Amino acid sequence: SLIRSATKEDGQAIARLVLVILKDMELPILEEVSEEQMIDLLAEATAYPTYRYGYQRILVYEHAGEVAGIAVGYPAEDEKIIDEPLREVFKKHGLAEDVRLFIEEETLPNEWYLDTISVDERFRGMGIGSKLLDALPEVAKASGKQALGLNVDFDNPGARKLYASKGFKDVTTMTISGHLYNHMQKEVE
């Protein structure tokens, strides 16, 4: 029902969705910090313009006036600065600043890079991811980028078919933390 860019008040909702990703990565920080505290830390980092999951980097899909899914991405040149805000928030809260997060080696030069499309578990099976993805060319374009890019795991040929059908084309191959990926791009107006 509504697609809009995230606001500062979408912090907790974005943080809940991001928690799912962390931990699916099995980040060791989740053994040391409770879920509730991790959500608070993430939400606070959300308020930084440059954060990986900063609201300014995020498109929201609103279903029944509630955050149902988010699409998150950034210019490729921003990849080395995106995790700094979360390290700053950790330092503020007395935690070690050098928590293991993402390996920052996944983009190609000159794309708007799609980091994640995440759909709330309560709203699966409703087309939300695929609609968020339809909205993304205009985001790349407004960013001055002529390519929108992404990585799909080799063992996700279903997702890869989905992106193919939306105009994405295989461009390279990457290995990140043992997993192999197809890097795909779609040209933008």
Automatic annotation (TrEMBL):
Keyword Endoplasmic reticulum applies: no
GO molecular-function terms, A-Z: acyltransferase activity, transferring groups other than amino-acyl groups
Key words of the record: Acyltransferase, Transferase
Segments forming domain N-acetyltransferase: 3-188
PANTHER family the UniProt entry points to: ACETYLTRANSFERASE (PTHR43420), N-ACETYLTRANSFERASE YODP (PTHR43420:SF52)
Name listed for the protein in its UniProt record: Acetyltransferase, GNAT family
Organism taxonomic ancestry: Bacteria, Bacillati, Bacillota, Bacilli, Lactobacillales
